[PDB]
Amino acid sequence: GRRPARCYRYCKNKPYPKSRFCRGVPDAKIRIFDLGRKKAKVDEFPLCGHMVSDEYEQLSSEALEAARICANKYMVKSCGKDGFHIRVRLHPFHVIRINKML
Amino acid sequence: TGMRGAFGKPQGTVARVHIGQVIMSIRTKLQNKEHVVEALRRAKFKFPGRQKIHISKKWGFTKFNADEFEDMVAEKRLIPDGCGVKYIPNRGPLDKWRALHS
Amino acid sequence: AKSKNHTTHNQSRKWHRNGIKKPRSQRYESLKGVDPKFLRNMRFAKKHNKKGLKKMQANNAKAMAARAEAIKALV
RNA sequence: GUCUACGGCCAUACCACCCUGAACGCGCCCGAUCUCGUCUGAUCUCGGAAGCUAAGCAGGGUCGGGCCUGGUUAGUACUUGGAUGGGAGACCGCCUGGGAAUACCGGGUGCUGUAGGCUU
RNA sequence: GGGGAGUUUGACUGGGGCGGUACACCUGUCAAACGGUAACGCAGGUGUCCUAAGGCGAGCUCAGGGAGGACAGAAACCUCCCGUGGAGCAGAAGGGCAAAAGCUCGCUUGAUCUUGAUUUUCAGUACGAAUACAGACCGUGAAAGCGGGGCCUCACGAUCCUUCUGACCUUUUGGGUUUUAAGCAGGAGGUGUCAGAAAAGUUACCACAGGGAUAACUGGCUUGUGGCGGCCAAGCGUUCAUAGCGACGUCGCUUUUUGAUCCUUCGAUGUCGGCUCUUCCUAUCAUUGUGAAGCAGAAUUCACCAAGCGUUGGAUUGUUCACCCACUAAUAGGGAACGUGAGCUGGGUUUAGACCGUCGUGAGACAGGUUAGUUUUACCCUACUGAUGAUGUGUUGUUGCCAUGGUAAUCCUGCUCAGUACGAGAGGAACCGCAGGUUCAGACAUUUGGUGUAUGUGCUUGGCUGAGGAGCCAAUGGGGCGAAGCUA
RNA sequence: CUGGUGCGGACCAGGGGAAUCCGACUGUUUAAUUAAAACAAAGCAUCGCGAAGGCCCGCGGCGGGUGUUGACGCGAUGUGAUUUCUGCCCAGUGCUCUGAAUGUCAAAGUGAAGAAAUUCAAUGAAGCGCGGGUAAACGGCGGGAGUAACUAUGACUCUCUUAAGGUAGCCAAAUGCCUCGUCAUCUAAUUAGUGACGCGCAUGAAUGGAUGAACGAGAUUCCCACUGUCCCUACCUACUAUCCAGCGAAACCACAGCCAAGGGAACGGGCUUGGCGGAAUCAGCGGGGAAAGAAGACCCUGUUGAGCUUGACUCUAGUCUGGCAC
RNA sequence: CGAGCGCACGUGUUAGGACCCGAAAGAUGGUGAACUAUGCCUGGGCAGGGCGAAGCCAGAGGAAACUCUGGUGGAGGUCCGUAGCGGUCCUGACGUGCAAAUCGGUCGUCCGACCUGGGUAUAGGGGCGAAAGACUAAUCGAACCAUCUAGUAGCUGGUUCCCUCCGAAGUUUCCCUCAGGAUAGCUGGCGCUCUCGCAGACCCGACGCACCCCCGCCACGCAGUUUUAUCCGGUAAAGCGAAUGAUUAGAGGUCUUGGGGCCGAAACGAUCUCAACCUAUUCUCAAACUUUAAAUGGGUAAGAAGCCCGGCUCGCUGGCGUGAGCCGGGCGUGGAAUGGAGUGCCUAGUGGGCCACUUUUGGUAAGCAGAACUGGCGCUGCGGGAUGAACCGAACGCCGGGUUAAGGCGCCCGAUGCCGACGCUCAUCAGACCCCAGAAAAGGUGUUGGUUGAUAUAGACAGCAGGACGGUGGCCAUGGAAGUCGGAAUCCGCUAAGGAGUGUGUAACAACUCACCUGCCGAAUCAACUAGCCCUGAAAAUGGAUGGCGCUGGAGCGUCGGGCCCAUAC
């Protein structure tokens, strides 16, 4: 059950959707992509901090969940409870298979 | 399984990145410059490989650029409405509303 | 037992070793497949062409004289 | 200028709304015995010609949508061909040639063959 | 009518008629903007159905939404408006269609007879399917025209034989007539292994041709699963993220697991485990030297240099594995063709004999239990332990030098230290000292023990030499005691 | 009475007991791996047959065996001493009987049509199909429920469903996967044994259930006695080996035979880079020569066979029945 | 407006083998019971002892019924045991043996279903079997001999002289087809039909060649190529505020319901509200989506088979016309670069491939399975990558001279034994060249380079003159706290500071340093990142590997200059 993302790191296939033809995919562990004071008006927060990926790879939904939580705990620690709006801007749509062996 | 017709079945769900993608954008008050990158650098340790971090040249999650954005808002070509700001060209049929009050 | 399936790549050089490339063109060809009504009619024209020579050549000796005189008579 | 019948291109011709109307030209419009067909002379069909351009229709207006055509997007994305080029890899730079599409910002908003009128 | 005979008992196939048709078909994709294209690649469908769901001609517009109307409601029926295919086209999906290719009517059989041409798959063979003309009879519509099956892409079949229809056909053997038979054309009866054989098992009693083109071992590539770590640090550790751990994430290593693959041998590498023996690795259970601790001492936990030296005796199974008693400083993990059969062993697995249970009508099968079951050859070369010897120094001897290669000792217990250090106390060490020991090594025979055919001595049974003597045979007769010698 | 307590003195000559499993015992077998729990065996139980017969051989006949025979006899089977039992199922597969209760049906032979070949109709033996009996013939044995008392289980009963639904017994056994089942004994410790427990994967009644004294070159466990099996190895004797005189083969043999690492057909004696190498030899040795012994018996392919079976496909002796003739 | 007979060759086929050598089997006719299996007839053979059956004789009890007790007797598929017969265990011996199955011990039986000689019978799909498929002459789950007969094979093995010339396939379709054929393709050989370069003693092309010039001459034709035109597609890329499908998020607004409401009564009422439903936006997607839409790609044309004329024929089409056809006439060839083309017959081998750049499906990946293009290995050697099927260069007759490619030049080893140039780096596991045989995420005030941000003679930075509290218990928590932590709080003053205190400190709670400039001697300091070498992260089982020795002012890494070295290439 481990199947560490070593196997499924590189992009190596034609992008699957959750389609009419692939059914029953396990739901991505990450589900909610906005954290913090996400009702804020634009005039409030004049600073946007990005994060760009410098490698062509695949990122796992499980990893996205861990990352989002880990980056929210610290920034709650510093800024506060209504000090930010963390918005994951990437979405897991490309499913991956696993060939069970006997 | 025994390779006599091996083909996997859905399991997990990933997302594909691109060199220059933006996996996470945090918005906050400018005072939090060294809280943003400080916290966000943790995500570099949850994701595989290396991801350059970065501070945006834009007001927020807007299409726009450095704070001449707010000058443009004063000109009323940008309407603060919601988590983003709504663009306004000078086209459109309200050539009486732009008269009555632009 | 088990066998290994095919692989199909040298059959591109196989042809060009000395393969031809044109259908061996020619002048007027075999009317096989033309509209048979037109075929019949044109055949009647041909049969009464290589008949009707006291028609054809006796009404074309005139044009023979005419061109054979005029092609010089321009001078 | 413009209309009528048949059209070719089939949106620069569509849609929305407001204004304008160079014959009886199309049309609305008045009737149903003849022809015809419907439950309904609404439609279709027939016979008309009192009023009407209110509508269709034509033309115009729109910081209009749409549509066509330009720019900016960009020599970016992409790729034919090369190397004992880098990288552990993922990928990437270069030599040589080709070279796009959104967002955004301009401009335009039917042309025309044929046979037939009129200048309201 | 398996009493007896002849014969058959498909192919594909990540080894094997287990499963499944990828065995005829058709759509979408892979498929890389000719267009061909692969796998038991992915999503799917067919062996039919229709007197109309065919052919014409005319007339209407569908999906859904909005406002209204008695029962009437979320939904019956009526009306108005919006209505770019959002609906329907027999069925898979794709394409195609809006005064139609849909919906409703009206009329009808072109779903008919007859040559050739072409496309489709390819040898550019046929079957299937389709294209466009030609000659007849027709259909509808005023007519122009459209129609020779389904809006297009699938929906089906050879020789031989049978059967049916066709012309006042040919032949039916010297001639004539008539039955019947054979002909010639067109349809049908079917071959789903779908270019078209008629066909059940079992061999552990087995056989021959072959195959490493193809399994069961080791050996390789990979490392998912197995094992060892590393990074990030929300938390647990009353307080504290990192003394000791570590979730959500993630990067590797190892080949001591199990897989995946078929490269090497099928004219053979002897394939489980145990016993004996060498040696190696380290990610260290114990020991030498060290840091750390939620470390007072005592124990114990983490980590570092490190394989020199240890890592046991037994009950049960064949056991690897496991489990338990006991001792121990400790009872760490592993490789060396899953070390090692011309080293043994044969317990099990894995022939032929049998038994029981389940399955089969039966022969038989069982990765179900049980029992008996031939382990072959060394003298060849090499390696290794020993043994003669060889060039050089003229011959020969005595006495030595030492490059080089081998390596060796380890660990524990008791007294003292010291009931002290250390501690509220419960508890309780260390250094040099002294005494001995466990494992290993090299020897040795004074004593002790074992051997004893010194045939050394006596004690004896049976027989034999006539007896006393003195012996001899009984494959060393047996039996006391035993020197030198070899030995624990 | 006598001997150093020695006296079946060489020789000749049984280790023992408490248990479990299987077979009753004696007997017999796989010559050249299987001596057994296999076969046989008495005992038990079947089935046919009154000789124009049962069974059986045969190419053939007034052929031939059992038959110099006759139901206390032959021929065909099953189980397997004694004790004590053998339960339920006849729908299935066979066997057999009935026949009126007869649907299906072949030769001949009978009618009707045609000139005839033909055609048609009726006719109707065996045998199927219809109906009985048969289990010491092949064989076969179930599921959810309610429901007493805390109740579960479940006494008593609802039924689909088969033909009947495992009765008497008995067990983790030669039969139980999970399995080293759970208790107790047996030991320090016992995956072994024994004794109990049984909705028992898959126990069971002449496919025999269950017992049981004797016996067994049969499989197990335990205890006493003995001991080089072992701790822990010594020593002694004869024959080899060894050396000499004489005599003197075979197996096997591409070339020859020092290793690491590398590449390679992924494990080299030969190749590459290294480490190095000395004449001729003797006794041992089992690491290598992927040593020898064999065109691998395992597995797959073979449009290659055989032995055997059956509800395979074609057939066949024998046999039943009808017709024709003597 | 025609061709048979004989001969030589090549191929396929049938065969007296049909290239040679080989099956397991099948059939016909015979020979064996001297081994053993079993019946029959006929003869022979079985020391010594243990148990004590039936009968039998006597002695005691007793009421008789009957019962005991002692000797006799010698039965048995009985018992221990020798010959005889067998053949258990040592998994003992020998295992190129004494032996194609024996030996030593210890073993079962030894009067019965016993052991054995001779005679006689049973014969191969047959006998015989106390049943193991055992025995039938060292052979049995169908014997031996001879013949049919060299049976047959899609299956292994081999398939004998030299040079010279040309030179593949492992792919299509069908097959009881998958280790095989047929068919196409690829191959060689035999030739042909023309080009016309012995092209004079004459004489040109917008048609080539010769050029005296082609009377004799087609420059006709072709292309794995670019060019100019005009066509075709729907992948890469891109899009969702463009349809289909998936999806985050806020807003702006009414509507349909709901939570609880309220009103007080239903109200989604003003308050709500929460969803929904819109309307403008918003974050991310598609092999089975698409408005757009490339690069490389596929067709056609780039002139005599053409163009312009003139007249007939047409049973077709029909205003008159159309179109197709024919006959006559005039004008020559048209874009670059190459070169001789066209055409027929016969036909061997192959239909097990493999690898690589790039694209791509299955998988975790594989020296794995499966596809496209092109090239190789196969079929092939040479230099170089030490070693090697493919990698790089490269293509071979036999040699001499010179020159290179890939490589390389301390020594092995030909070449730097040049003045080689600028730098980086210390490794108690350094590093050292495509495929290629040493690995990462994460760290380093090891050492450099660089980006950005802060401060500096008016001395900035460390070490000195300060400064670490004077108001002050100042608020005033009394959970005690001029600091109080765990006290809600909250001022001065001095340019020096000390906030109403940094926490150690439980003596209330004191002591300690905390923070901010000029003067102490005196010049640059510090912070946050990034990427180069080296380092930690980093574990193997025989002793070993940048090729080895070795090499640290390089013989290491990056960018570079000359000069040299050699292949079968030039």
Write the DSSP symbol of residue A10. S
Yes or no, beta carbons of A42 and B21 under 8 Å apart: no
Instruction: Tokens for A31, please give them.
Output: 């589900």
Q: CB–CB of A64/B24 below 8 Å?
A: no
Q: Where chain A is broken, by preceding residue (C–N > 2.5 Å)? A: none
Residues 9-28 of B with CB under 8 A from A: 9-28
Using a CB-CB distance cutoff of 8 angstroms, which residues of chain A are in contact with residue B50?
Answer: 54-55
DSSP A39-94: T--TTT--EEEEE---S--EEEHHHHHHHHHHHHHHHHHHT-SSSEEEEE-----E
Which of B1, B9, B11, B14 should be substituted to probe chain A, the one whose Cβ sees the most A Cβ atoms within 10 Å? B14
Continuous H helices in B47-96: 68-74
Identify the sign of the CA torsion A54, A55, A58, A59: negative
Give Cα separations from A34 to A65, B25, B46, B93, B100 (angstroms).
12, 10, 19, 36, 39
Chain A CB contacts of B4 under 8 Å are none
Q: Which nucleotides of D are covered by protein (CB under 7 A)?
A: 62-65, 89-92, 103-106
Residue B13: strand, helix, or coil = strand
What are the tokens at B66? Answer: 């450095």
Q: Please tell me what resolution, in angstroms, this structure has.
A: 3.6
Pairing of the two strands B24-28 and A47-51: antiparallel
Name the burial class of residue A72, with classes exposed (0-12), middle (13-18) and buried (19+) by CB atoms within 10 angstroms of its CB. middle
State CA A29 to chain mean position distance. Answer: 9
Do the beta carbons of residue B78 and residue B87 sit within 8 Å?
yes
**Side chain identity at residue A16, one-letter code:** Y
